[PDB]
Write a protein that binds this ligand. Structure first.
Ligand SMILES: O=c1ccn([C@@H]2O[C@H](COP(=O)(O)OP(=O)(O)O)[C@@H](O)[C@H]2O)c(=O)[nH]1
Length: 454
């Protein structure tokens, strides 16, 4: 009977994790409304079989969709600029939320709690107006949440224009160099606007009684407890891992020996340099390893030149190498043929790798990738560092890539990284299981929503 209204920023990287929160919340006997703009919601309509607000059953509960217009044309280039679209969403969101809460109370299914996104903190402003509690979903590590929080509150000195190389020492965190904090917070970063977009939620954080993070207690225990006095953070992850599809990727991996395929993926946004693609190709070619390389075409908005492989690379590479543009990463990471994972250290790939027990080769670029790569190599003990990010502006040569591919496949260090990754796999799976640390936190979340209604 409890109805929760989830609002999400219109981006793929934001919609999919919030969808996982909807599935985990609905399974507990809850009615979950997933809300975003129409231009992003239509992707969810044709992905499944929903064209209206028909109740889709998810376990003991249901999931329905509700989309509001943003007054932009179908493929408006205006949406690509956050300086306009972030206030535009606030304009169109603040006039849609109150009229649908009053109608839901009229129809007998009133909203008990709000769950929003840091990119749309106006939901917390609206939740306070209607007297409905609000919570914020955070799809980054709590260690990164601590970084943004202490940057906004100036707890310690951070890299500034005058002092850009200073270290940052935060409680319950390792010592972070200037390029190890989230790159959007560096004064020489070209994506400061993304940092300002995340920091907008910290002007509003008091209006959310708790923050839901896509992590588990065993991974960041010291960090979650350290943020308690500043913000009640509840671990509900890994959200992708079901508590209780296929492609030609899995069919190809079925033919390879266990722990012998290198998985390469750089996410959905990051596009590395052509010269670095050349060095990675020669690295895989001369090392003699088997690999599955995801070469995702970039969005046409950027004037990116398409990545070209070396002359005759895919010919010298035999049946032991597979180029694709997309693969079910969760199913590939769980395949026994995968040895390591060359990743850009996106938080979703970071959590997916740890939950799957796959050691990684850290090649971060920007954002929280440089902070995730630090914990993967120096804290979680499952990674092999390749670079320090886009600000390093260094092409990693073939021989260094070659030495790291062999370091993560054969030798004594490979067995140590695999044993640490296996131990993190048992912790992640236990957390989302019945009675685990994350599943219990989800139960405690539904409890406080029931307690706050009266
Ligand atoms: O071929 C691919 C590439 C990526 N992903 C998924 O895309 C997400 C990437 O998000 P992440 O936070 O790691 O990096 P981002 O792309 O957001 O920078 C993860 O859930 C991956 O499982 C996937 O399923 N197949």
């Amino acid at each position: 009977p409890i109805h929760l209204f989830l609002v999400c920023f219109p981006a793929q990287g934001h919609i999919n994790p919030m969808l996982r929160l909807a599935k985990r919340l609905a399974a507990k006997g809850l009615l979950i409304t997933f809300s975003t703009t129409e231009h992003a919601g239509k992707d969810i309509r044709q992905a499944n079989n929903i064209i209206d607000d028909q109740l889709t059953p998810v376990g003991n509960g249901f999931i329905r969709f509700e989309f509001f217009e943003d007054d932009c044309i179908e493929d408006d280039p205006k949406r690509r600029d956050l300086d306009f679209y972030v206030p535009q969403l606030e304009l169109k969101g603040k006039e849609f939320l109150p009229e649908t809460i009053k109608r839901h109370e009229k129809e007998g299914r009133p909203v008990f709690c709000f769950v929003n996104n840091p990119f749309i903190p106006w939901v917390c402003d609206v939740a306070e107006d209607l007297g409905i509690p609000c919570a914020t979903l955070w799809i980054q590590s709590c260690a990164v949440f601590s970084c943004y929080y202490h940057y906004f509150h100036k707890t310690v000195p951070f890299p500034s224009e005058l002092d850009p190389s200073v270290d940052v020492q935060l409680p319950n965190l390792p010592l972070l160099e200037y390029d190890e904090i989230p790159s959007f917070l560096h004064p020489s970063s070209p994506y400061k606007i993304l940092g300002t977009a995340i920091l907008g939620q910290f002007k509003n954080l008091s209006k959310s009684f708790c923050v839901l993070a896509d992590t588990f207690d065993e991974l960041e225990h010291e960090i979650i407890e350290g943020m308690s006095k500043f913000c009640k953070v509840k671990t509900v992850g890994p959200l992708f891992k079901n508590p209780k599809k296929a492609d030609d990727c899995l069919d190809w991996l079925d033919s390879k020996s266990p722990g012998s395929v290198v998985y390469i993926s750089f996410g959905t946004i990051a596009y590395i340099k052509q010269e670095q693609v050349e060095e990675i190709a020669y690295g895989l070619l001369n090392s003699g390893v088997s690999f599955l390389w995801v070469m995702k075409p970039p969005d046409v908005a950027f004037g990116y030149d398409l990545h070209v492989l070396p002359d005759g690379f895919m010919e010298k590479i035999g049946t032991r190498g597979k180029i694709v543009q997309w693969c079910p990463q969760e199913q590939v990471l769980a395949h026994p043929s995968v040895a390591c994972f060359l990743t850009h250290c996106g938080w979703n790939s970071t959590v997916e790798a740890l939950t799957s027990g796959v050691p990684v080769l850290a090649y971060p670029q920007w954002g929280d990738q440089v902070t995730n790569a630090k914990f993967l190599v120096d804290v979680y003990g499952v990674g092999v560092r390749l670079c320090r990010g886009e600000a390093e502006n260094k092409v990693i040569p073939r021989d260094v890539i070659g030495k790291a591919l062999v370091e993560a496949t054969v030798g004594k260090r490979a067995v140590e990284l695999k044993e640490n990754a296996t131990r993190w796999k048992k912790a992640a799976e236990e957390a989302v299981a019945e009675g685990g640390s994350s599943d219990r936190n989800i139960q405690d979340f539904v409890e406080e929503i029931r307690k706050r209604s009266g």
